[PDB]
Design a binder for these strands. Structure first.
Ligand SMILES: O=C(O)c1cn(C2CC2)c2cc(N3CCNCC3)c(F)cc2c1=O
Ligand SMILES: O=C(O)c1cn(C2CC2)c2cc(N3CCNCC3)c(F)cc2c1=O
Ligand SMILES: [Mn+2]
Ligand SMILES: [Mn+2]
Ligand SMILES: [Mn+2]
Ligand SMILES: [Mn+2]
Lengths: 669, 669
DNA sequence: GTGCGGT
DNA sequence: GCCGTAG
DNA sequence: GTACCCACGGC
DNA sequence: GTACACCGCACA
């Protein structure tokens, strides 16, 4: 791993802790060959304030640094054997780079605290993006070159203060770490604390607001918007043909999302499972996993492409219904949020683990979710207990069962709640006084065979009894189906209701609805959830109708001047011929006909065949049809209750085209 | 990594060897746990024919199979002890799988031959030439290939004791010649030896034309061609900014080349190393490896575009210059050969290992190379040694020196020769009567690092005396420069003369100039190569000229149609007004103006803009000059010799523009 | 024991 | 201990 | 082209 | 994220 230096007298030495490997062997040619040692960390390291001392003492990066430090840790730290008087921490200049920073610091205050004081702790000044993508000496000259390199020694100033920060930030009290976050939510020396409060604040945020949280409008995280905008743009629409995966990842990684390949493929892969997603936004072709936890074949071996329902996610996008922004480097654009013409958030659900928070939303039945909004339009002052009159509860893709209106009903209420999910099981008598236990629908997010290696574990472990055999017989002809053989005399129902206890045959969805609303992290309710979506349904379908307006009048102006042109044809054709530079002609048609630049230019673009019979006539046939569209579009605008209908019209056309009954059963009791 | 059936009874039990990891995983999921137990193969196996036992045994894919079956190797063999009674070999309908299928066959015959006799050794028949096993679902893998209902298998029959041993020997044998020969000669139950022949052969063939064998005409292998083709389709010519490596490959792979991004990358990557390619065919961004032998960066982190010199490989390609082929899936088109407006093969070099053969080709200096072409183009009866007044021999990007003319000399005569690559070390003074050797240039293809290490390995191992320090001091200024101290008052030149014959300071280039000629593996001497090249160019300029002409012949024609109307215009204006459709309007213009169907449209489709003064003379000015062009072309076509000097000039301008000094120094005595 | 496109 | 996007 | 670490939060 | 191991030649 490490690459060491010739000078074995620490003084003229120093080690660089450099983020990745891509940037690690770059640095392995920029670096001086006799005064500069490199230690490539292989990825985000252990937290030393979360895990106890036997763990710390193990994660390889953690060990690897100790020896390579020489000083020895804890209370054996002889800062004398200190191999380096200048240890540089050269983390990428991204968020996961300041984030890797805090993690090394947390290790260098509790385990080499004298080191910080000593005067060896450093922070190279990488030029701003990305680390890896630099040359070997492009790495020497800005960062490892003493002649030109900008560094940072970490002054531990007030140990009383730091001692208190380091616990809040990397401590086990998630809730402390949030309170700070929420409060600071604005949208040649370096003090160790002056570092953390920023180097973690930026990360805490960007993770919350540009990683692990699904917007409230499209119900989408970024890595998803960017996979569904790219299917969009690359025009791999459902009527067309599957593209290989690594080609869309190729496209998406390039343009919008500078991150690992793995993160993007496995992400679009989920969007592609009839069991993961309630309403799959991807057409998977090729091996795409299975319920046993198996993973889609590698991105080079599969194909995807939009789904019919995905269009509704991006329908009317090009009519200016949402704001585009430059991408990451400013060479491309991307949607800030897609149209989401259909209740996507609650429909498909969500799960993500943040920094301060985490979110968990269940998948609900679209049809149910629609009436919900439908009713929700006709009454801004509606009660959840009523919204729930249209929305029985979530509906998992795994069907399965749900217990009580009660676990369900609090979630929606207050925002957080607990739902007990349970498998579809049946007892059936095999005669001769015998029994057997046949699950056909496990719960949602429940790895099939690991529930079975889980019952396998019990039976061989004599922790539960009276089961003779355990077969998976599941066929893509029967649906899920776990047959459990029961012994004679021994009671099965017993063995059933103990398999709910002891195994995932019964599991619980921890509803906790933190979605990104108005830009920030937010716990919300069923009412709130649809309200802010219905809002984005008003705020799309409106902005469109106005673009159609604009796009409408714009054409009827060009037409106006066009008909005038066909009506005084004979003079127009000579006022051109008798004009040399078309700059002059544009100057004629205007004065003589009371016309406008955009109009006289247009005429000067008219093709001879636009003068035949139909083509002439067709033309004015287009005009009188536009003015119905125009007044209408304005009718639509000058009466809320109309635009509002369009919304209901459309939200209902959807519910009639894609709606599907319920799979999950809500059992009352 | 074998997922064994619950079943413990051979008569019903059948193992599966699958092509990939992925293939394997789908198989494992669409398989019957009851009776179908699957052992996947990670890539390639071992040749138990070419390799000897200590080595076979210590190998994995064999042992893995050995335990699986649970029978025994060679004499230990016992038909009863066998876990399974169907051993199914599942590789895909791709040559590479054809050959793997012939690699496992090897095993079963050399070690479990008796096993074959019982009929346990089976072959699986996936759908033909559709795709990689891995593409299909697990359900798609069961329904066509594994389900006993609709599955077709080939039972391997050992027909003749006598011929089988020899055949296996020949195809998988140590002796190259007999495999080279067999190939060339050939240029339910299944007969195993007719199967080892065809599927091996079917494979061996692809690996030549469409694998690791440069074309004579463009110098390019399928893999590079393919990268350079698409570079030019994406349109990232040197003038355009870099665009990530991931996008590029994902693309070449998703339009042309069905293989490992890893293989595509490090191939594309080479093209971009100024020390790899005499004239780099790419222009990278970030870490693209370096001399001492560090691989390149991760295709995520890098960017890439053509060189200005690559522009000339794809000059005039969309001008009907060379035939087009359909891509592996028939969903896109690709060039069968890049136009190569410069002699790439002998320029950049090339060196792969095929089947029964292998090419190895040096680099030369473009300037030299062109001059030889011009002179040979001039004297098509020119003596080889007359070509050497122009072409003195190779020229490695690394530079260096060569040792003697008969070395180069017989290389260019029989296709093959041995060329002495030394280095340029200088001896000089370090101070105090103490000396030093200094090496500033290494043999091409020599790895600077492994050269330095493998010198210590001879001092430490006291196999070379008087060496008292050796650093490698290569910076960007020094370029290459390695220092070797000589214990003063000791003959530095006697060491240097030994380090030469001991290590990689001096290396043998074993030239075997083979490359696809008239579509087959040929051996060509300097001339043929130049000729084959030369003829390509003669056959390109002509076709371009053929195309530049039907394009002018076609545009003059129209330039007229317009003129015509532009003159007799008011009546033109009338014919159309007085007409109801373009149909009549045409058919009217066509006859009552003598206008061609073609010219008629050209007017029907003419904007008013061209009624003015200028626009009527921009036509005029354009029409006349198209006559002076067709003049030229009709001149260049109608003569074997102008077509021949257009080439000479056109190449005489490349050399003029991209041509450079010699770096490798040619010494004798 | 090594170059290069392949599983 | 695992739900999922990032080193 | 897959194996083997980490964070981050809730239950 | 490097480790990991194989076909295929020819020539030291
Ligand atoms: O595309 C590639 O570069 C590789 C692909 N594969 C798998 C075959 C597709 C590899 C597999 C390797 N192993 C699997 C077989 N036994 C262990 C080693 C390997 F070492 C390297 C590679 C590649 O470089
Ligand atoms: O992009 C990714 O999925 C990964 C990237 N990296 C490095 C950051 C690029 C990893 C590094 C890992 N390590 C394994 C050995 N011990 C610590 C580092 C790892 F297990 C997984 C990954 C990835 O999955
Ligand atoms: Mn980064
Ligand atoms: Mn990963
Ligand atoms: Mn294949
Ligand atoms: Mn590889």
């Amino acid at each position: 791993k490490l690459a060491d230096c010739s000078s074995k007298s620490p003084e003229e030495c120093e080690i660089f802790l450099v983020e990745g490997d891509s940037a690690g062997g770059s640095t392995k040619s920029g670096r001086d060959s006799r005064t500069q040692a490199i230690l490539p960390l292989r990825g985000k390291i252990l937290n030393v304030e979360k895990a106890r001392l036997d763990r710390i003492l193990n994660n390889n990066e953690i060990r690897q640094m100790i020896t390579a430090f020489g000083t020895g840790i804890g209370g054996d730290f002889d800062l004398a054997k200190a191999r380096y008087h200048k240890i540089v921490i050269m983390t990428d200049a991204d968020v996961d780079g300041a984030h890797i920073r805090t993690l090394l610091l947390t290790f260098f205050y509790r385990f080499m605290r004298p080191l910080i004081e000593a005067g060896y702790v450093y922070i190279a000044q990488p030029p701003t993006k990305g680390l890896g993508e630099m040359n070997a000496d492009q790495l020497w000259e800005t960062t490892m070159n003493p002649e030109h390199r900008a560094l940072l020694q970490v002054k531990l100033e007030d140990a009383i203060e730091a001692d208190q920060t380091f616990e809040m930030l990397m401590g086990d009290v998630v809730e402390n770490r949030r309170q700070f976050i929420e409060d600071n939510a604005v949208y040649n020396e370096r003090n160790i604390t002056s570092e953390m409060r920023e180097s973690f604040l930026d990360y805490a945020m960007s993770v919350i607001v540009a990683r692990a949280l699904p917007d409230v409008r499209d119900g989408l995280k970024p890595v998803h918007r960017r996979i569904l905008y790219g299917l969009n743009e690359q025009g791999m629409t459902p009527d067309k043909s599957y593209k290989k995966s690594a080609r869309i990842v190729g496209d998406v990684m390039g343009k919008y999302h500078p991150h690992g390949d793995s993160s993007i493929y496995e992400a679009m892969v989920r969007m592609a499972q009839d069991f993961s997603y309630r309403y799959p936004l991807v057409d998977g072709q090729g091996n795409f996993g299975s319920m046993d936890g198996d993973g889609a074949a590698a991105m080079r071996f599969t194909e995807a492409r939009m789904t019919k329902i995905t269009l509704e996610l991006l329908r009317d996008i090009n009519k200016d219904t949402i704001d585009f922004i430059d991408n990451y480097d400013g060479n491309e654009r991307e949607p800030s949020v897609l149209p989401a013409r259909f209740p996507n958030l609650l429909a498909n659900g969500a799960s993500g683990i943040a920094v301060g928070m985490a979110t968990n939303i269940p998948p609900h039945n679209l049809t149910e979710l629609i009436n919900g909004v439908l009713s929700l339009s006709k009454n801004p002052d509606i009660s959840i207990a009523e919204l729930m009159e249209d929305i029985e509860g979530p509906d998992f893709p795994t069907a399965g069962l749900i217990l009580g209106k009660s676990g369900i009903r609090r979630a929606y209420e207050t925002g957080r709640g607990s739902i007990q999910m349970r498998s579809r099981a049946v007892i059936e008598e095999r005669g001769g006084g015998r029994q057997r236990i046949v699950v056909t629908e496990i719960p949602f997010q429940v790895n099939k065979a690991r529930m079975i290696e889980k019952i396998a574990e019990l039976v061989r472990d004599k922790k539960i009894d009276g089961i003779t055999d355990l077969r998976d017989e599941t066929s893509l002809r029967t649906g899920v189906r776990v047959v459990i053989d029961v012994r004679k005399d021994a009671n099965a129902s017993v063995i059933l209701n103990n398999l709910y206890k002891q195994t995932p045959l019964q599991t619980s969805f921890g509803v906790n609805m933190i979605a990104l609303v108005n830009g920030r992290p937010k716990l919300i309710n069923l009412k709130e959830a649809l309200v802010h979506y219905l809002e984005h349904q008003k705020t799309v379908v409106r902005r469109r109708t106005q673009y159609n307006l604009r796009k409408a009048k714009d054409r009827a102006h060009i037409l106006e001047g066009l008909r005038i042109a066909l009506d005084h044809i004979d003079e127009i054709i000579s006022t051109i011929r008798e004009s040399d530079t078309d700059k002059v002609a544009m100057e004629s048609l205007q004065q003589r006909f009371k016309l406008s630049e955009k109009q006289a230019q247009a005429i000067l673009d008219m093709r001879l065949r636009r003068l035949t019979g139909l083509e002439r006539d067709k033309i004015e046939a287009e005009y009188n049809e536009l003015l119905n569209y125009i007044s209408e579009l304005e009718t639509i605008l000058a009466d809320e209750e109309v635009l509002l209908q369009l919304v209901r019209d459309e939200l209902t056309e959807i519910r009639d085209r894609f709606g599907d009954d319920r799979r999950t059963e809500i059992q009352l009791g």
